[PDB]
């Protein structure tokens, strides 16, 4: 059976109803009862058992949490969703011997779309001695996670040759933080002298360039 | 016989019924010359989680 | 019911892995243990399932070859082996107890393998210099091996605006992460800025000075 | 009250005894005078009252239909079993306030046990180009009922992603029809050469496979 | 006696609908109003019923928060209102009669309740060639909503051999048919084969030749 976790990635504000759906490709119905489950995992922790059947909460799970549905169209609701709600939600079987986990959910805390915070590094002196270059794009404190992020290296695009990783929403700021890292050999890096990132955000009318010359 | 069940399932707790309490936890004969008393106890027997 | 694992196992393409979890607070005879892969940041796949009492085995189809499962009620305990470890079996394991009518009920820590042919490497870090209201600058560290890398800044005295993104793993198999502070312009020509960073697996701690 | 029904469906030759069973939880009997009914509702066509009471007939009742039983036991009895008389029965109960009606019969004449005619089709060009395609397995005048269609993509069995439909019985052929879709993504259509279908129905000694191949 | 009702309500979830069944041929004063429900293909679960007389209206356990009943002697019709609708509550309601000591004894007709977020869709139709006796062929109807679509073969010239399968809803919250005929191998040549398909609440007529 192949569970399909349908919105696995959804953004709601404090007191709002929260709604994750998974299906199924065969019935999970057996022996009259449903054996389907709901688990939570907060970053840095192990699973954690949420709604243990179809409806049945687990030890120490707030009444927040409910769980709804049969066959196999099943649903988990967080209306009065509050802080540490952050977290990965998964659906799975338990009627066939092959126990199989959905996609997964990373249920995020909506706050404005904001406005990126775009800045530029140049490759230190010291690493350039070294015969590698790195010159690193800075977003900080923007919302949604979703934007686009290019090289431009003298009016060119570059693909293949850069590095991307984004931090966790932050607890009271709620918005993320975006870094791309772009790295080249010493003799590549020297032979240009723009170089540029670009921008494209909900947050942004336009897309937002920064560009520096070498030297 | 007295026990706690939920609200649903009263509809159970009769003569010739089936379901997961009746035919499983109290099963009441087909005669039966009594009585069934059934009220909502949500104020006493449920408690916060 | 308290679950324990081992930590940190690293090893290079070929070998064989070992994973103990001790189990508390249960009989440990009457619940079957259940072990779950998740590569990081990725979704969660059952592997297969042990009996304590009886040593009776169940597999995922995929994972029948590369697994073996043996159970230790005298120590109360159960031991998966992988044999022939490869980049993609790089992940945290689980070991978990049986109930309410779960297989994986009960979840322990977590245990990590990371499969690689690399070598213990010092990390280097560069000062990445504001450009000539508020501004931003940070630290780059690359090529080290492996996570984690404590970063920080002033010792501990910086803290705002601080952010250390996740690292990468790189082509070559090292790994790649930056910290980045914002202050504001006015501090760039007198206050000092330095970046603290700890690599324990080759004991490496550099302090190094950003200056525009 | 809860009422349990005989057979859901009953299969008898023109002419023939049809019995329906009905059982009640409580007994329906009150005042003297029996209160267990029995409706008969033609598809396309409002309920309609054949039995009131335990046996008095309903007004314009042909005396094809008698009601018969009392107590917890009751049975509907058409022994000129009629082409017209092709409907769903229900037996209720208007003892108690909540009126309660049984789980329906449908009857359905007899006739021989017919080999399906099996045929498939590929999805139209036309709906490729949409990004979807739907393969169809067709079952053209083949009785019983009773039909297992499978999906094989590649010899892969295939689950969840297949719908089927039946036809009520023809007026003259008497025989059933039955069309099963299997509907995809046309980029996972095109990962796939060998479609088939599996037909195992009770006319046959084993199932019989149709399969094509894409283009 | 005569029973008349509305015509197929539709409603996205969550709305009220306020629902008619006007009675004729007695003096409905002297005679209780009963509503039940019925979903497609299933059973029948009774409603409730009312008193015209005096307003003294009683439900069903299930179904006493969702739904009121009401009378209007002075036009002899009831009223039943449904509030905050689920898809569960899709089906068609019947209001009868009392008679012969039945409850629901004599019925009317019997209207269609349709609880769906989709809106109209356009019905899109395409052909099922036959394969390279008698062959087969058809037309595909997918992405359609509501019902009815009528759908015939050359404008009703080709009949016999005609089967039209009823519509299956999908998980979309759309609705897709086949309309399917065998033809003797002899035509396939020489006879061109059209399926007509006409669905009135989005005005759609569309006339697609099948071809080999």
């Known amino acids: 059976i192949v569970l399909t976790q349908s919105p696995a990635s959804l953004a709601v504000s404090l007191g709002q109803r929260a709604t994750i759906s998974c299906?199924?490709?065969?019935?999970?119905?057996?022996?009259?009862?449903?054996?389907?489950?709901?688990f939570q995992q907060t970053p840095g922790q192990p699973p954690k058992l949420l709604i243990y059947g179809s409806s049945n909460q687990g030890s120490g799970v707030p009444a927040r949490f409910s769980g709804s549905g049969s066959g196999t169209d099943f649903s988990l609701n967080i209306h009065p969703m509050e802080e540490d709600d952050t977290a990965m939600?998964?659906?799975?079987?338990?009627?066939?011997?092959?126990?199989?986990?959905?996609?997964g959910t990373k249920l995020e805390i909506k706050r404005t779309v904001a406005a990126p915070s775009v800045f530029i590094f140049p490759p230190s002196d010291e690493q350039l001695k070294s015969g590698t270059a790195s010159v690193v794009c800075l977003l900080n404190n923007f919302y949604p996670r979703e934007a686009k992020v290019q090289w431009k290296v003298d009016n060119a695009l570059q693909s293949g040759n850069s590095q991307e990783s984004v931090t966790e929403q932050d607890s009271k700021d709620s918005t993320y933080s975006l870094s791309s890292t772009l790295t080249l050999s010493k003799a590549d890096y020297e032979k240009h002298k723009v170089y540029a990132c670009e921008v494209t955000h909900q947050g942004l009318s336009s897309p937002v360039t920064k560009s520096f010359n070498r030297g | 016989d007295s026990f706690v069940i939920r609200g649903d399932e009263v509809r159970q707790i009769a003569p010739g019924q089936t379901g997961k309490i009746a035919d499983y936890n109290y099963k009441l004969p087909d005669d039966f010359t009594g009585c069934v008393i059934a009220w909502n106890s949500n104020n006493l027997d449920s408690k916060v989680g | 019911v308290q679950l324990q694992q081992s930590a940190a196992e690293l090893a290079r393409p070929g070998a064989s892995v070992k994973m103990s979890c001790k189990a508390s607070g249960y009989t440990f005879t009457s619940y079957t243990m259940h072990w779950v892969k998740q590569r990081p940041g990725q979704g969660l796949e059952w592997?297969?399932?042990?009996?304590?009492?009886?040593?009776?085995?169940?597999?995922?189809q995929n994972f029948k070859d590369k697994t073996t499962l043996t159970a230790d009620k005298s120590s109360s305990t159960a031991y998966m082996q992988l044999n022939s470890l490869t980049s993609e079996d790089s992940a945290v394991?689980?070991?978990?107890?049986?109930?309410?009518?779960?297989?994986?009920?009960?979840?322990?820590?977590g245990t990590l393998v990371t499969v690689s042919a690399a070598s213990t490497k010092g990390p280097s870090v560069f000062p990445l210099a504001p450009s000539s209201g508020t501004a931003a600058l940070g630290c780059l560290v690359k090529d080290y091996f492996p996570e984690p890398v404590t970063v920080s800044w002033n010792s501990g005295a910086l803290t705002s605006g601080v952010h250390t993104f996740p690292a990468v793993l790189q082509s070559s198999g090292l790994y790649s992460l930056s910290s980045v502070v914002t202050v504001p312009s006015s501090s760039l020509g007198t206050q000092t800025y330095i970046c603290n960073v700890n690599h324990k697996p080759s004991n490496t701690k550099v302090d190094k000075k950003v200056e525009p | 009250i809860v009422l349990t029904q005989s057979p859901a469906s009953l299969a008898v030759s023109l002419g023939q005894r049809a019995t329906i069973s009905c059982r009640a939880s409580?007994?329906?009997?009150?005042?003297?005078?029996?209160?267990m009914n029995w409706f008969q509702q033609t598809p396309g066509q409002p309920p309609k009252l054949l039995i009131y009471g335990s046996s008095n007939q309903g007004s314009g009742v042909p005396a094809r239909f008698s009601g018969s039983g009392s107590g917890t036991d009751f049975s509907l009895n058409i022994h000129p079993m009629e082409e017209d008389d092709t409907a769903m029965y229900f037996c209720?109960?208007?003892?108690?306030?909540?009126?309660?009606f049984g789980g329906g019969t449908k009857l359905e004449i007899k006739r021989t046990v017919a080999a399906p005619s099996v045929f498939i089709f590929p999805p139209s060009d036309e709906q490729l180009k949409s990004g979807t395609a739907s393969v169809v397995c067709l079952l053209n005048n083949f009785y019983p009922r009773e039909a297992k269609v499978q999906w094989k993509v590649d010899n892969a069995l295939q689950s969840g992603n297949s719908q089927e439909s039946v036809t009520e019985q023809d007026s003259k052929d008497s025989t059933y029809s039955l069309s099963s879709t299997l509907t995809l993504s046309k980029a996972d259509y095109e990962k796939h050469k060998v479609y088939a279908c599996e037909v195992t129905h009770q006319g046959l000694s084993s199932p019989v496979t149709k399969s094509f191949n894409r283009g | 006696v005569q029973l008349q009702q509305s015509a197929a309500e539709l409603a996205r979830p969550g709305a009220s609908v306020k629902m008619s069944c006007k009675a004729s041929g007695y003096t409905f004063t002297s005679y209780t109003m009963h509503w039940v429900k019925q979903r497609p293909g299933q059973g029948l679960e009774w409603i409730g019923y009312?008193?015209?007389?005096?307003?003294?209206?009683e439900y069903n356990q299930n179904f006493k928060d969702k739904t009121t009943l009401t009378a209007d002697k002075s036009s002899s019709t009831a009223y039943m209102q449904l509030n905050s609708l689920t898809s569960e509550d899709s089906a068609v309601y019947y209001c009868?009669?009392?008679?012969?000591?039945?409850?629901?004894?004599?019925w009317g007709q019997g209207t269609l309740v349709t609880v769906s977020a989709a809106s109209t869709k356009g019905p899109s139709v395409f052909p099922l060639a036959p394969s390279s006796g008698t062959a087969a062929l058809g037309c595909l109807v997918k992405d359609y909503f509501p019902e009815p679509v009528t759908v015939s073969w050359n404008s009703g010239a080709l009949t016999s051999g005609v089967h039209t399968f009823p519509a299956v809803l999908q998980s979309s919250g759309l609705y897709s048919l086949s309309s399917v005929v065998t033809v003797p191998s002899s035509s396939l040549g020489t006879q061109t084969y059209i399926c007509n398909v006409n669905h009135k609440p989005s005005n759609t007529k569309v006339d697609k030749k099948v071809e080999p």
């Open positions: 209720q109960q208007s003892k108690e306030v909540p009126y309660t």
């Open positions: 009312i008193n015209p007389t005096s307003g003294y209206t």
């Open positions: 009868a009669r009392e008679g012969h000591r039945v409850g629901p004894a004599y």
């Open positions: 409580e007994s329906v009997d009150n005042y003297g005078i029996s209160f």
